[PDB]
Design a protein around this ligand. Structure first.
Ligand SMILES: C[C@@H](CN1CCC(Cc2ccccc2)CC1)[C@@H](O)c1ccc(O)cc1
Lengths: 386, 459, 48, 48
């Protein structure tokens, strides 16, 4: 009889668990199984963290699982993030994400054995870099909030611009929860640079649209480059018609992420059980203080996975454990509607037959981004000189 | 009111001689009356910890959780922080895995430990390395959550003083993969400094010292210095640790376990009584386990302001804004031959006292020992003796810290004062140029009585 | 006069301003509350 | 520094690597035979 191997997963509704159990049954059929037998075991996102931890130590860890999946808590608000859940496996050394858009998981210290197959908000900045090559930009302004996503996007944008090419001008920070932000628009307007790149949440982007709207700053020359949290929800009616936006392909109902997830994990199990040793996880969380000897090795097998003929496209992991070749779609607000004006496969940006409309009523992007006069010259106090 | 204060004890130590405390009943001058409830625990799994916290919380309405163990795992301590995410209870660290610091924590968490952070301990280590004239040093850090402020604290500290320090290179080692591709040895072979600061955990220090023990890393010229989170418990000593490991701690030998628990109960009860004595309005007690959406509004952060400046028995037993003690009474211990942590220094908030140990640092181990005493006289042009500045207390660059043994002639009674100054001149220059070439350790001091040799009667 | 020469040799406008105190790069060495810092001078050209 | 290597015993006590790790010269001379040069190049190929 083949060895019974269990696979842990954290899903939301029951339909996703049905697609998971079906994907495991297909994984035990399309793959040659001569000594192992995959088992489907998934739970639901509990509203409390203690009951969730007990559900893992009494549903997932008690079944001796090797790989654990995670998605997103089905809640309209955000108060109890599942990040501490990722610490649970940290006590037993691998969890794969599905819709985790927060870049906090990109760190290696607090998230050692953790990998995800979804491009966060930082990868979108890479696409923004392509924008800097689409119309030849140089001076850009990054306006982010004062938290971890702003620092991560700042270090990522600074890391991408480390050669002798363009650089960053003045990065503005603000506390998430302050509406009176007129000084940011005054200091941002006084600066010669006009390329505005906003990367915040909804309530902040609404204040940027209101404060920036009551000062007449949406005319010609002003460019607004946002992501996805600025053109969805209540921040859509306040955004100007012609703002450059983004849209992730297959945001809701990601059955391909579950099927390809069980495919990659199944390949890592069938391929992992062909070398030596291969220890077994402990039974439950009752008197198990020792760590797992097969942790970084399992993460190495999960990272070295290639699927050029996959459903989503080309599954490939980088050196940090993210999702390479992201598939986005450059959108543009036209007549109170989101009209598709571009697509991003992963390597370059492909444009369709729709012309990009600028919020300042312009249709063609000029060569020079901004030029004028009025030079400020300061000097010290010296008797023989000045 | 009688507030419940539970003390969690993890380990094989008999709690019968520990729970018996006589510092109650008569020591209840405050209007609030606490009660001690100590529990035991054998295993060190998170399921039993969360189980005893939830069952003990729903069973007894406790207010101050004092967790104390004896293992050497920091991740479990992080789990304690997770408990705060579900409780926001001022958890105090006394000894064990909960005695390790963790920089950059949650602004809403209430994780407080008696041990100081890396800013104070780093300053103590730099003071020890400054008194013994240890300029060239090395830094070995790993992937521990809290190294950016460590390296930036060391650099930002050495860039301020006028002493001619020297920094070789701050390397980094990985522990997820074993040393099988020949990289850790290649990173450690470039360290030729006499003093090396280690910043990692215990299970990582066993492997770093395991490889360094094979690759000529232990004897003289490669002295390793670890803070308090590396050694942890002074009763668990393996074998791979070499002789001569400078460590620091807090009280430990002075204040035992019942003293630390009593001080923790005094801090929790005092801080819980200042709001009732000043604001005259306190909320309810803690709720059960999953009932957090209803009691999440009753939590008040004002008590945090009462967890920074705390006084007790006159001594400055307070904390800071980062969640650690501001002015600790640290104790410096050094490993000897029989593998036992013996006290060698006493650091009081500021001043450092070296009374249990003499002036000489090493003793006898393989390699050569002793040194060479050098005495001179303040001869201008050649030997220029200058007093040490009171705003520093340490000589800089080639100025040799030349001591001075004087005796206070108090009427008909003499004493023994040692005033240290800074000597510099031609003799210091030539003796240091030839001393650097021939490579040996020496000493320098002056003469206080007898001056130049002469004839007395017939001798 | 050099600023007037450079102002007439090139078609542009300027505005001269006097700088006050702080002519040493601002070396962060005084212990100010046990916290981090950031470069805000040294070169002296980017204030705003 | 003219170093000397011993081929009687295999590199099992971590000594040949310690003697060859201190060679930071752009040109190195090898004075030995063939079966010894294959082992010196075999260990040096793994060390660097
Ligand atoms: C592994 C981490 C600690 N680790 C365990 C706890 C986890 C936080 C957590 C909170 C609540 C519930 C579950 C988990 C955070 C990560 C630490 O030991 C470490 C990091 C880096 C390093 O070189 C050495 C040690």
């Amino acid at each position: 009889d083949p060895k019974i191997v269990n696979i842990g997963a954290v899903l939301s509704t029951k339909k996703h668990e049905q697609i998971f159990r079906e994907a495991v049954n297909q994984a035990n059929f399309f793959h040659f199984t001569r000594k192992i037998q995959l088992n489907a075991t998934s739970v639901t996102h509990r509203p409390n963290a203690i009951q969730m931890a007990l559900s893992v130590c009494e549903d997932l860890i008690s079944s001796q699982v090797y790989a654990i999946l995670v998605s997103h808590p089905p809640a309209p608000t955000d108060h109890l993030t599942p990040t501490p859940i990722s610490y649970t496996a940290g006590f037993y050394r691998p969890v794969i994400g599905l819709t985790t858009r927060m870049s906090i998981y990109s760190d290696k210290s607090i998230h050692l054995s953790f990998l995800r197959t979804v491009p966060p908000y930082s990868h979108q900045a890479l696409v923004w870099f392509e924008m800097m090559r689409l119309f030849n930009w140089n001076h850009v302004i990054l306006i982010v909030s004062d938290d971890h996503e702003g620092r991560a996007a700042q270090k990522k944008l600074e890391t991408l611009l480390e050669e002798k090419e363009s650089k960053a001008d003045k990065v503005l920070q603000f506390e998430p929860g302050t509406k009176n932000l007129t000084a940011l628009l005054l200091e941002a307007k006084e600066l010669e640079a006009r390329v505005i790149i906003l990367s915040a949440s909804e309530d902040d982007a609404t204040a940027v649209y209101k404060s920036a709207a009551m000062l007449d700053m949406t005319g010609a020359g002003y460019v607004w480059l946002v992501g996805e949290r600025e053109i969805s929800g209540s921040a859509l009616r306040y955004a100007p018609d012609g703002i450059i936006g983004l849209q992730l392909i297959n945001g809701k109902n990601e059955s391909a992420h579950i099927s390809d997830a069980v495919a990659v994990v199944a390949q890592a199990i069938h391929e992992l059980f062909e070398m030596e040793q291969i220890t077994d996880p402990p039974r439950g969380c009752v008197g198990n203080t020792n760590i797992w000897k097969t942790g970084p090795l399992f993460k190495r097998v999960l990272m070295s996975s290639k699927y050029p003929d996959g459903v989503t496209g080309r599954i490939e992991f980088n050196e940090d454990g993210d999702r390479k070749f992201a598939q986005y779609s450059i959108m543009n607000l036209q007549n109170r509607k989101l009209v598709q004006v571009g697509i991003f496969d992963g390597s370059y940006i492909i444009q369709n037959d729709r012309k990009i409309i600028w919020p300042g009523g312009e249709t063609e992007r000029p060569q020079g981004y901004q030029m004028s006069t009025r030079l400020k010259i300061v000097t010290i106090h010296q008797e023989p000189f000045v | 009111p009688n507030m419940d204060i539970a003390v969690i004890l993890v380990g094989t130590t008999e709690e019968v001689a520990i729970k018996d405390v006589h510092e109650k009943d008569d020591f209840h001058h405050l209007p609030v009356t606490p009660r001690v409830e100590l529990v035991t625990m054998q295993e060190s799994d998170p399921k039993s910890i969360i189980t005893r916290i939830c069952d003990l919380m729903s069973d007894k309405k406790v207010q101050g959780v004092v967790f104390g163990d004896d293992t050497d795992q920091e991740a479990i301590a992080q789990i304690l922080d997770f408990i705060s995410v579900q409780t926001l209870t001022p958890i105090l660290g006394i000894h064990g895995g909960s005695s390790m610091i963790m920089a950059d924590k949650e602004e809403a968490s209430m994780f407080f430990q008696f041990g100081p952070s890396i800013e104070q301990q780093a300053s103590v280590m730099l003071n020890i390395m400054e008194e013994y004239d240890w300029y060239i040093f090395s830094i070995v850090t790993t992937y521990f959550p809290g190294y950016q402020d460590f390296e930036n604290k060391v650099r930002s500290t050495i860039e301020n003083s006028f002493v001619g320090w020297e920094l070789e290179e701050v390397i980094h080692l990985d522990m997820s993969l074993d040393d099988i591709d020949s990289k850790i040895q290649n990173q450690l072979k470039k360290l030729q400094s006499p003093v090396i600061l280690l910043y990692c955990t215990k299970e990582e220090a066993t492997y770093i010292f395991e490889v360094a023990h094979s690759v000529g890393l232990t004897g003289y010229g490669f002295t390793w210095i670890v803070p308090s989170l590396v050694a942890g418990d002074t009763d668990t000593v393996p074998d791979e640790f070499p002789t001569g490991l400078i460590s620091v701690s807090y009280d430990e030998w002075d204040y035992d376990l019942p003293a630390r628990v009593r001080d923790g109960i005094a801090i929790i009860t005092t801080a819980a009584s200042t709001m009732l004595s000043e604001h005259n309005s306190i909320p309810q007690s803690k709720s059960s386990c999953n009932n957090i959406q209803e009691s999440r509004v009753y939590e008040a952060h004002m008590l945090k302001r009462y967890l920074i400046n705390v006084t007790f028995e006159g001594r400055d037993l307070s904390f800071s804004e980062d969640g650690y003690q501001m002015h600790p009474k640290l104790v410096i211990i050094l490993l000897n031959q029989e593998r036992k942590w013996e006290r060698v220094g006493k650091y009081k908030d500021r001043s450092l006292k070296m009374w249990p140990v003499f002036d000489l640092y090493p003793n006898s181990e393989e390699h050569k020992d002793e040194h060479l005493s050098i005495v001179t006289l303040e001869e201008a042009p050649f030997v220029i003796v200058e007093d040490v500045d009171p705003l520093s207390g340490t000589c800089m660059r080639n100025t040799v810290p030349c001591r001075k043994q004087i005796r206070p002639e108090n009427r008909t009674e003499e004493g023994g004062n040692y005033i240290k100054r800074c000597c510099k001149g031609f003799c210091i220059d030539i003796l240091k140029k030839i001393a650097k070439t021939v490579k040996f350790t020496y000493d320098l001091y002056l003469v206080t009585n007898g001056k130049h040799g002469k004839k007395i009667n017939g001798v | 006069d050099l600023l007037i020469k450079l102002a007439r040799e090139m078609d542009f406008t300027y505005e001269v301003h006097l700088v006050a105190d702080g002519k040493f790069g601002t070396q962060e060495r005084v212990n100010n509350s046990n916290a981090a810092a950031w470069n805000g001078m040294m070169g002296e050209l980017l204030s705003g």
